[PDB]
Write a protein that binds this ligand. Structure first.
Ligand code: HEM
Ligand code: HEM
Ligand code: A1CN4
Ligand code: A1CN4
Ligand code: H4B
Ligand code: H4B
Ligand code: ZN
Lengths: 414, 414
């Protein structure tokens, strides 16, 4: 029954939820790895024996969720998937068990500050899919729906679960919409340095790059273990916000823009022991993810010098805080640009307050809320947002989202 | 033999130092408490039995440090304090063992970004002190020395170790130089809200407050268990930087200022099992500690609105990032003000780069460097400083600095 304090408000919350926790974290009693980016625990091949307790555990919270824990419909469903796990060494979720598992995977994501919206998640069941083309169609219907003309909506599309392991649905994109990354002669990078390995993988499979900055990458979709295939999202479906500033008219001259739809596609969704290797999910952007990380990370677009230049900034000494000054401006423009286009965006203040609000309800009507402070604190102006001052317990509940290796490092090809 | 990566540079460092670790962290395999502010492990009454392994462990690294591990002078010193621990149920450090233990307490402080300077620490041995007045004199000689007319120097003053526990030297100030905090009629706060409980404690013992903003508090010094006593640092010894901006001439009109000398006085220094309950230590300020936390924390001076006002800032909508804009300005002024006065200050960029440099040498010539990411990442512009992208292993080595309860909640009075 652990206590967590908010040192800005002296609010104390009591966490019992962490007792239901199951998975391990990477920390021990003599070492804390809370700052390791991809702990071996957060990465993802299972058998039929451990598979039933997982099913049991998940089915018991789900019937407990729809009020009727331990009833006949529960006991039958337990026997039912017991039977099905004996016979097939795996099983299938009901439509509702899948919607529930997905929403709670998000709910349990300790690194996600947007979780106040976890209950309003749209679950598209793609488990009937069999081909890369059908994947492409489900993904496009996802994009269109979640984009909703800038009034963005949370959604997830769940392709068939892993079975043997060699028959595996995977989106090879990290996100359905990402800009291409091209190395240059001198070595420098056009576009997004993050995706340079992925961009050339696409060309290795036949992409015809328009070698510029913001070239929306094509989808590389692997279906049921087969070699992936290239499909270009219809451009009318990829909404984009050109970035201007509400003061500096040279900001348009910077010629930047970003897509409205954040949509992570490389993660693994775990539910009742079942593994969904392709499950792209989307919501809306927090300002900082674009203006701080995408735009100003050194190994991303790296625009701080160019913005500071135009601002006429003391770029000599480090202590001029020119980098900080040009970073707040870039985030002012991103927010303003997205808002003047009716494209859903949230600032890091509004988003981190709501997370504290969310944390309250989770400790009240759930007994806790796993939270990773390393990741919840926004990457600029940490301590002026209320999550900097909120102690948080990190633990691993299931259903959950896990990392998984890249397909091209595991795919037994051709 | 754990690995930590820098995701900005793809640098990998290998940590074996954590194997020498001894104390626990608060994390377990199923829960990470890396964001708990004062874990029960980081707080501080010991006997004579566990006291010798502690002495042994510390003496073995110290003679290993001066090259002659296991020699006769080592073995004799081991027998010597063995003998002394049998006879007195405690023991005394040699002058050099104390200088070493202190420097390594700092070296091991995982929450300190300034640790690149740990070897150049000036150790003042105050273990002959017996009276609050003698404390006051050692503390003043500390202030004067460390201040060094703005060319600040790192130092620590070590008062006698705890023995029985009822005879205990304690500085009741959190820092030797802090501004007084006064509640008002309407409830609001003049001065520093942090110290309001301490400020009225001082008046409870007879302080004559000049009830303004930046009133340097008096020292409240407890010596050998006796009731503490009030002493006012000579004002010529308290250096102060008035805060101006190198653009906004109304910034002087804000009328702010800060002391040059950060000097934490409430911590407990542990060496070879011995407990030094009063051990004030000082270095120089990182810009952000004043301009971000001191000035802009909600429950500190809370000047963001007043600075934004004068900047003529979009203070209506939250998403205007006015708070961020006024926060970078305040930090530009702090750095500039301290630098135009030849008072040693370091910006959070320069300081966090040096910490990465420091981390390199610690993994190379020591096998690791315990680091608390929650605390090493500066509280503004996190991800544009290189420590945001540096994975860090947190573990607890000794000699170390520990928190300890406030004296007025433990002091058996009068
Ligand atoms: C609705 C708006 C949302 C916002 C504003 C939001 C915000 C964020 C942010 C800022 C991060 C940190 C990632 C980074 O900065 O690199 C994150 C991580 C994450 N989010 Fe959310 N998110 C949203 C929706 C969703 C949805 C719909 C899901 C799943 C269905 C989700 C699941 C996750 C996961 C799994 C992580 C990372 C966990 C990890 O890395 O281990 N989020 N989110
Ligand atoms: C020389 C310049 C120094 C700088 C720039 C510096 C910087 C910092 C900063 C920014 C923090 C985080 C505290 C906060 O933001 O609230 C910190 C913590 C700390 N520093 Fe350093 N510091 C310096 C010198 C020292 C010295 C001389 C010592 C000890 C002799 C020391 C030991 C510590 C300890 C023990 C902590 C906190 C550990 C904890 O809270 O558990 N530092 N320092
Ligand atoms: C190398 C890893 N690093 C780059 C972080 C990558 C990452 C992994 C992950 F699973 C995530 F959910 C993630 O969330 C971004 C995100 C997703 C959604 C739906 C909304 C918002 N607003 N944001 C970001
Ligand atoms: C409630 C706790 N919270 C307010 C943090 C307090 C705290 C505790 C502590 F032991 C510290 F060493 C500390 O370091 C401040 C510091 C010290 C020195 C020598 C230099 C710099 N530049 N800075 C700050
Ligand atoms: C070293 C550290 O684990 C890494 O830089 C983390 C820190 N916190 C983060 N927080 C978020 N939201 N996103 C990130 O990519 C990271 N990166
Ligand atoms: C909740 C959290 O533990 C607390 O706010 C910490 C976060 N990191 C920090 N880091 C530093 N340097 N100083 C602090 O006071 C804090 N506060
Ligand atoms: Zn931990």
């Amino acid at each position: 029954f652990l206590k967590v304090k908010n040192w800005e408000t002296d609010v104390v919350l009591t966490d019992t939820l962490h007792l239901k926790s199951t998975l391990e974290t990477g920390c021990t009693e003599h070492i804390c790895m809370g700052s390791i980016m991809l702990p071996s625990q957060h990465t993802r091949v299972a058998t039929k024996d451990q598979l039933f307790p997982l099913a049991k555990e998940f089915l018991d919270q789900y019937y407990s969720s729809i009020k009727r824990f331990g009833s006949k419909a529960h006991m039958d469903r337990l026997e039912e998937v017991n039977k099905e796990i004996e016979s097939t060494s795996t099983y299938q979720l009901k439509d509702t068990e899948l919607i529930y598992g997905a929403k709670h995977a998000w709910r349990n994501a300790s690194r996600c500050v947007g979780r106040i919206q976890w209950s309003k998640l749209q679950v598209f069941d793609a488990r009937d899919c069999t081909t890369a083309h059908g994947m492409f169609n489900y993904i496009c219907n996802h994009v269109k729906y979640a984009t909703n003309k800038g009034n963005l909506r949370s959604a997830i599309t769940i392709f068939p679960q892993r079975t043997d392991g060699k028959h595996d649905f995977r989106v090879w994109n990290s996100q359905l919409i990402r800009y291409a990354g091209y190395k240059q002669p001198d070595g420098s990078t056009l576009g997004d340095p993050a995706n340079v390995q992925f961009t050339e993988i696409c060309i290795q499979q036949g992409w015809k790059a328009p070698r510029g900055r913001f070239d929306v990458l094509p989808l590389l979709l692997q279906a049921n273990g087969n070699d992936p295939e290239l499909f270009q999202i219809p451009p009318e479906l990829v909404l984009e916000v050109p970035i201007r500033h509400p003061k500096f008219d040279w900001f348009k001259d910077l010629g930047l823009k970003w897509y409205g739809l954040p949509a992570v596609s490389n993660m693994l969704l775990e539910i009742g022991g079942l593994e969904f290797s392709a499950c792209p999910f989307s919501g809306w952007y927090m300002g900082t993810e674009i203006g701080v990380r995408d735009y100003c990370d050194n190994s991303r677009y790296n625009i701080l010098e160019e913005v500071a230049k135009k601002m006429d900034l003391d770029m000599r000494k480090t202590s001029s805080l020119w980098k900080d000054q040009a970073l707040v401006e870039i985030n002012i423009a991103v927010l303003y640009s997205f808002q003047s286009d009716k494209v859903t965006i949230v600032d890091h203040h509004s988003a981190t307050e709501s997370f504290i609000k969310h944390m309250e309800n989770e400790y009240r009507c759930r007994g806790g809320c796993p939270a990773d402070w390393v990741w919840i604190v926004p990457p600029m102006s940490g301590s002026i947002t209320p999550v900097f001052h909120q102690e948080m317990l990190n633990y691993r509940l299931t259903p959950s989202f896990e990392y998984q290796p890249d397909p091209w490092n595991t795919h037994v090809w051709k």
